[PDB]
C-alpha cells in the first residue's frame, strides 16, 4: 500500500494469479453497466475504485487506485482483520492448504485474525504498532483482550468506537446474508477510528481470493458474528 496525498492509495497487484483476480473483482463490482443490486450495494463497503493505474513510463507496473479509507482522519487508529474460517480458497493444493492453516491454525475456531493495528496514544503523542505475529499469537482465551487493545488510547476504552464498529459490521453482515454469488477467502476488514466520537470506518479490503458461489459465505458470516460477539463483550468492560 502506497499512501498518496490526494486521498488515494495505490495497491500494487500481487503476483499471478492473485493480483489479476483482485483486478477482475474490482472491475466486476464497479462495472459501469452493472445494475446487479447485490454488487451495487457492495460498493458502499469497499474502497472507492478509480480503476487500474500504471506509471506513465511503466505500463508493466500494475496498481489498483483505491480510496484511502484513513484519509479523512486526523490521527487514524487502524486495524486490519482477516475474516473467515478458511484463508485458503477452493482451488488450493494440499500443500497450500497446509501452508495457510499453519499460518494460523485457529482460523476455523475463531473465524478471524488480527493482521495488525496502529493505535494513537494521546498522552505520549505516539503510535503503538502490532504486526502479524501479534494476532497470530491470540487464542480463544486472549482474543477479547487482543482486540480490546485497538480501542485503548491510554486513558479510556473507546466504547464509542467499539459500538460504532459493531453497527457498521452489522450492515456488512446483512449484505452477506442477502447474497449467494460471492465467497471471500483471505479478505479483511479495515477498521479506522479517530485517535486525536463514534466516528468510524469499517471497510472490506483485499480481494485476491474472491470466487463465484452458489451458497452463503458461511465462513465469512461466522467470522463477522464472532467478531461482533467479541466487540459486544468489550462493551461490558
Ligand atoms: C493506511 C494503513 C493501512 O494499514 C496497513 C498497515 C499495516 N497493518 C494494516 C495494513 C491501510 C490503509 C488503507 O487505507 N485505504 C485502504 C484501501 C485498501 C487497502 C488495501 N490493502 N490491501 N488491499 N487493499 C488498504 C487501505 C491505509
Amino acid at each position: 500500500i502506497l499512501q498518496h496525498p490526494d486521498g488515494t492509495v495505490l495497491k500494487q497487484l500481487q503476483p499471478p494469479p492473485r493480483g489479476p483476480r483482485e483486478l477482475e473483482f474490482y472491475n466486476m463490482v464497479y462495472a459501469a453497466d452493472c445494475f446487479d443490486g447485490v454488487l451495487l450495494e457492495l460498493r458502499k463497503y469497499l474502497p472507492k475504485y478509480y480503476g487500474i493505474w500504471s506509471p506513465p513510463t511503466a505500463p508493466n507496473d500494475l496498481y489498483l487506485k483505491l480510496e484511502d479509507v484513513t484519509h479523512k482522519f486526523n490521527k487514524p487508529c487502524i486495524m486490519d482483520v482477516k475474516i473467515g474460517q478458511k484463508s485458503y480458497d477452493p482451488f488450493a493444493s494440499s500443500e497450500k492448504i497446509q501452508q495457510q492453516v499453519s499460518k494460523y491454525p485457529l482460523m476455523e475456531e475463531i473465524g478471524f485474525l488480527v493482521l495488525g493495528m496502529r493505535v494513537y496514544h494521546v498522552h505520549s503523542d505516539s503510535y503503538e504498532t502490532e504486526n502479524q505475529h501479534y494476532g497470530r499469537s491470540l487464542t480463544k482465551e486472549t482474543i477479547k483482550d487482543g482486540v480490546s487493545r485497538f480501542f485503548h488510547n491510554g486513558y479510556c476504552l473507546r466504547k464509542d468506537a467499539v459500538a460504532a464498529s459493531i453497527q457498521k459490521i452489522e450492515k456488512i453482515l446483512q449484505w452477506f446474508e442477502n447474497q449467494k454469488q460471492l465467497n471471500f477467502y483471505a479478505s479483511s476488514l479495515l477498521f479506522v477510528y479517530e485517535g486525536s466520537g463514534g466516528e468510524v470506518e469499517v471497510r472490506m479490503i483485499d480481494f485476491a481470493h474472491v470466487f463465484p458461489s452458489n451458497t452463503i459465505d458461511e465462513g465469512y458470516v461466522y467470522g463477522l458474528k464472532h467478531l461482533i460477539s467479541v466487540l459486544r463483550s468489550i462493551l461490558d468492560n
Side-chain angles (χ1 to χ4, degrees), residues 1 3 9 11 22 26 47 66-71 78-80 115-118 130 190 192 204-207:
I1 291 305
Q3 220 156 359
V9 297
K11 185 186 178 180
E22 183 169 42
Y26 275 108
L66 298 173
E67 177 189 357
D68 182 345
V69 172
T70 74
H71 185 239
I78 311 162
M79 172 175 72
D80 186 351
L115 292 186
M117 54 180 78
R118 190 148 177 285
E130 299 289 3
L190 189 64
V192 191
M204 294 164 66
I205 64 164
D206 199 358
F207 302 118

